[PDB]
Structure 1
Amino acid sequence: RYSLRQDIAVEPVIAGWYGWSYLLPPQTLARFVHNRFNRIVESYLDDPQVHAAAVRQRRMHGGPWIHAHEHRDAIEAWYRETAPRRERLDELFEAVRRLEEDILPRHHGECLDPVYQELPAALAGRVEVFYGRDNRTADYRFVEPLMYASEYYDESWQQVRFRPVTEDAREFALTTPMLEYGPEQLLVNVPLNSPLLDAVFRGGLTGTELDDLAARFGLDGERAARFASYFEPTPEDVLEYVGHACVFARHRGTTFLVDPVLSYSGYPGGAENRFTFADLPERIDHLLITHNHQDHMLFETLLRIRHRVGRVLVPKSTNASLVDPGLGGILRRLGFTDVVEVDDLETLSCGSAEVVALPFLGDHGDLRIRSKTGWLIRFGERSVLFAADSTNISPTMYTKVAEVIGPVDTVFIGMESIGAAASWIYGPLYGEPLDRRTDQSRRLNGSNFPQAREIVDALEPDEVYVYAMGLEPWMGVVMPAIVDSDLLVRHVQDKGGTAERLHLRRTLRL
């Protein structure tokens, strides 16, 4: 009997690209493909040189640049093979532009029933329209499950690409098409929610069982043998930090994992003491996610642990808009079948703990998005709060919050006190651009020193760690402020308590 090697990664791929939340729902896919992914490809076909030149200065990583510039011929063939896809998806892009731009501004406060009469065939039956607060300006929302039911959500445009992992750091993956760039890699068509991937990550297969598996993925010849080679012979009360904003926990034998992202292992030259896919218990009872940003809920990680998961807790949103579509339903298309959505300050009991959802402000470019929460976990008398990227930009909200929830022992706050422009993530979903100087004042930032101070001062914790920092090398898949972190470590220590910025790993007494 055999199992996947710790040093093979199985990378999520949707419509040619490294896979994440907003590529799943056809209506957001379409805004990205049209307004970003085609622009990146065409720009590259025209001058491979810019991209190479760009890729070479480390400091230009994260821009709209293809990292496998050597492979011009393959990329061109791929673009052209997929033209009927990019074209059926543009049919949706046009419907939506048509409704936001030609149909909705026609109306000024009267009955809207005349609109369902005029909807593009793409949207017919799949949207609801209404006025906003002024009663005169018309808006809309998608009926999400009907979208997924439509021909525009297509499971066949999904894939996984197996490849070896030889070191800690990761190259920035979001702007480069997912293809077989080397014989070590294996690109395979399967839907992301498939139970075949579950077979894989679970393992314990005989050699003939692997052949069967591999034949159900439609593999044979050398591909089937590459596939086979990715497999090797099958070999309390804790609070473990493990990377970026990901924290593991056992409490009277119930397991918790917050904002999942994990590194790999099985290769020379690692970093001592990492917490890896290999360090995981049998079952993950409760998976918690603070928001919808890749650094907090990485598809690659999630697909891998899916088979071990009990319940997923996530914050409730019903906007069913482009900028902000239902987290919970995304998780369901990924194959998670027990997902619970929690409103502000609702309380769920979890094994022997109690989990409370907390209000979470900012980090989203002052955009209309409801998928954010922090979590407070009460393990009997000790009680820990995970705040992720949430910033304290509303003076008293924390006082009022404390009045309802009682005292808190331990706090994790994230101080990416300056990060990206919000258009960097959300930009292709907008309707038209903002004028540059405005767009510029709309950032994704974590709490800085003063804000962070006032969080601490209003919750009176005895322990106070700062995470979500983006230090660990493997976060490079997807992505001054230290001055501030340190200001805070001293503040909290000077006031008679433990504090510490986190990097790489840490056991902690629970």
Structure 2
Amino acid sequence: SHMRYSLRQDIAVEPVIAGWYGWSYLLPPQTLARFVHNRFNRIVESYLDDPQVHAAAVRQRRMHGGPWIHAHEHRDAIEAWYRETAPRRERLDELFEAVRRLEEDILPRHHGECLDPVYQELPAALAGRVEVFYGRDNRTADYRFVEPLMYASEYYDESWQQVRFRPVTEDAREFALTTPMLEYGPEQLLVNVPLNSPLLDAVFRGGLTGTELDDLAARFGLDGERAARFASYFEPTPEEDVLEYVGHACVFARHRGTTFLVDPVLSYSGYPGGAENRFTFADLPERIDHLLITHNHQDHMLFETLLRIRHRVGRVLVPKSTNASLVDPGLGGILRRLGFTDVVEVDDLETLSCGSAEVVALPFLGEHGDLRIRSKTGWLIRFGERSVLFAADSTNISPTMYTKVAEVIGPVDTVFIGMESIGAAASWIYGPLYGEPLDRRTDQSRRLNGSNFPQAREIVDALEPDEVYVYAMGLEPWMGVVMAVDYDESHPAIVDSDLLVRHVQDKGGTAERLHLRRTLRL
């Protein structure tokens, strides 16, 4: 009888952890502690020291992605925020100092003898919460986190999580990763709530009466005009095979009524001036049966997108890892703290049935800065007699691997492969996680590259697909949230993608660099 309301398509709900745009490595506390200390505090202090440097940096597109505050006009509120959160920072530096002590002062004292004494000397922040052992040489001690006891600790604190609602008025997004997530304008609403909260599911599922929205707003502890603003984000609430390239590395599929979404990133709608025919949140089906993530890079598992869709998701598939290290924290446990309750980790070449499809994980090597990170896979999906490979940014640095893989998995019809063949220094993503820096020129040799032409070619030659699509190029303007979009057919990447398309056509098959949305047969 009563009117029902749902979240507007043009309102974004941005994830925030400890004051910053939320992504994987900010959830576990030991990795948060490293980022806060080695990066975020340095960004605030630098900024507070001379806001004009940042202002001046932000003024040039080519500096976008550096350690700059973009809301540089808001010095007072940023300072007030930094000042207020100083106790969060001191609690968290306890953990930072504990890991330093373990790595620098405790582990190096031992040289092959029983490691029992170490446990007796642990800092309290880590007592009961780590395991130590020797590496392959039997003499150099190392450790790993007992991940769930870390999340149970005082240092993982849900009260430091928030979302920020705001309108979306264009396709393009400003780089967000280095700016505190404050209520910078009155169109914005910053709300304290855990990212896993069923309250956010209520929000995204919608279909609420007006008095139900008020109840919800009260459960968020909103009153007054803030509740009114909240209410204003809502509006009256308005079957066979598909293969839909939606953007970057994100692909949607349907097969005999089972739905799939790989490497999810979606754009918004309801505002004038954006590009036509984009696949947005409004275009999603009711249920996403299988959500597949290839690896733990920002551009392939976007928190903002994951939360907006959580309520529709059945099962999440992801790469398996037990490293339980600062460079390679447990991905399934991250997704579970985001509130995904049915997450399955898949090892190399394991197979899982999904609806009428079969999924197989494929070895993914490279693009991780030669770090010890196990959390990465390609996904092969067999949809009946048609098989599709999502390779994401996986490389072909290991000659023959794909030949050996083909011998086991058989033929593949279609391949999606990414060709960001020149990428970031591995330290611009991972550097705050190091114990210390590498010498600058050495570091510079460690980069996050996808396949170049030759590599991509050998992949194709080895698997013999009829269709090849290059993808994951960070061209869509909404990807700017997380990376520096700036195209031009000089860029070696574009050249190489072209060479590859060439190559595949010459050999008598279809190929194309996908750029915006594309329907495909399957």
Tell me the number of residue pairs that the alignment of Structure 1 and Structure 2 aligns.
510
Q: Deviations over 1:410-452 (max 9, x none)?
A: 0000000001000000000000000000000000000000000
Instruction: Return the offset for 1:133.
Output: 0.2
Q: Deviations over 1:29-86 (max 9, x none)?
A: 0000000000000000000000000000110000000000110000000000001100
Distance in 2 of aligned mates of 1:490 and 1:64: 39
Give the corresponding residue for 2:486: none
Distance in 1 of aligned mates of 2:497 and 2:411: 23
List alignment gaps of at least 5 residues for structure 1: none
- Map of 1:272-421 to 2, 5 A cutoff? 272-421=276-425
Distance in 2 of aligned mates of 1:403 and 1:462: 18
Structure-2-length-normalised TM-score: 0.98
Of 78, 87, 96, which residue of structure 1 is paired with 2:81? 78
Of 138, 141, 145, which residue of structure 1 is paired with 2:144? 141
Instruction: Return the offset for 1:367.
Output: 0.3
Give the corresponding residue for 2:132: 129
Of 512, 517, 522, which residue of structure 2 is paired with 1:500? 512
Residue 212 of structure 2 corresponds to residue 209 of structure 1? yes
Of 205, 226, 233, which residue of structure 2 is paired with 1:230? 233
Q: SS state of the match for residue 254, structure 2?
A: strand
Distance in 2 of aligned mates of 1:46 and 1:270: 38
Q: Deviations over 1:367-422 (max 9, x none)?
A: 00000000000011110000000000001000000000011000000000001000
Q: Deviations over 1:77-104 (max 9, x none)?
A: 0000001100000000000000000000
Instruction: Return the offset for 1:355.
Output: 0.2
Distance in 1 of aligned mates of 2:493 and 2:320: 31
Q: SS state of the match for residue 67, structure 1?
A: coil
Q: SS state of the match for residue 294, structure 1?
A: coil
Q: Deviations over 1:197-230 (max 9, x none)?
A: 0000000000000000000000010000000000
Distance in 1 of aligned mates of 2:317 and 2:189: 33
Distance in 2 of aligned mates of 1:302 and 1:78: 27
Distance in 2 of aligned mates of 1:375 and 1:46: 47
Q: Deviations over 1:468-490 (max 9, x none)?
A: 11110000000021000000011
Instruction: Return the offset for 1:272.
Output: 0.4
Instruction: Return the offset for 1:307.
Output: 0.2
Instruction: Return the offset for 1:261.
Output: 0.4
Instruction: Return the offset for 1:122.
Output: 0.5
Q: Deviations over 1:242-288 (max 9, x none)?
A: 00000000000000000000000000001001000000000000000
Distance in 1 of aligned mates of 2:437 and 2:179: 24
Q: SS state of the match for residue 257, structure 1?
A: strand
Residue 459 of structure 2 corresponds to residue 449 of structure 1? no
Q: Deviations over 1:314-373 (max 9, x none)?
A: 000000000001000000000000000000000000000000000000010000000000
Distance in 2 of aligned mates of 1:363 and 1:63: 20
Q: SS state of the match for residue 379, structure 2?
A: strand
Give the corresponding residue for 1:196: 199
Distance in 2 of aligned mates of 1:282 and 1:226: 27
Q: SS state of the match for residue 471, structure 1?
A: coil
Q: Deviations over 1:78-137 (max 9, x none)?
A: 000001100000000000000000000000000000101000010000000000000000
Distance in 2 of aligned mates of 1:294 and 1:395: 28
Q: Deviations over 1:154-197 (max 9, x none)?
A: 00000000000000000000000000100000000000000000
Residue 251 of structure 2 corresponds to residue 247 of structure 1? yes
List alignment gaps of at least 5 residues for structure 2: 484-491
Distance in 2 of aligned mates of 1:213 and 1:286: 29
Of 33, 37, 54, which residue of structure 2 is paired with 1:34? 37
Give the corresponding residue for 1:259: 263
Distance in 2 of aligned mates of 1:384 and 1:93: 43
Distance in 2 of aligned mates of 1:19 and 1:464: 33
Q: Deviations over 1:135-154 (max 9, x none)?
A: 00000001000000000000
Distance in 2 of aligned mates of 1:57 and 1:379: 46
* RMSD of equivalent CA atoms: 0.3
Distance in 2 of aligned mates of 1:481 and 1:410: 21
Distance in 2 of aligned mates of 1:509 and 1:149: 47
Distance in 2 of aligned mates of 1:240 and 1:166: 25
Structure-1-length-normalised TM-score: 1.00
Q: Which runs of 4+ in 1 moved over 2 A?
A: none
Q: SS state of the match for residue 349, structure 1?
A: strand
Distance in 2 of aligned mates of 1:375 and 1:69: 42
Q: SS state of the match for residue 102, structure 1?
A: helix
Distance in 1 of aligned mates of 2:464 and 2:215: 58
Distance in 1 of aligned mates of 2:432 and 2:35: 6
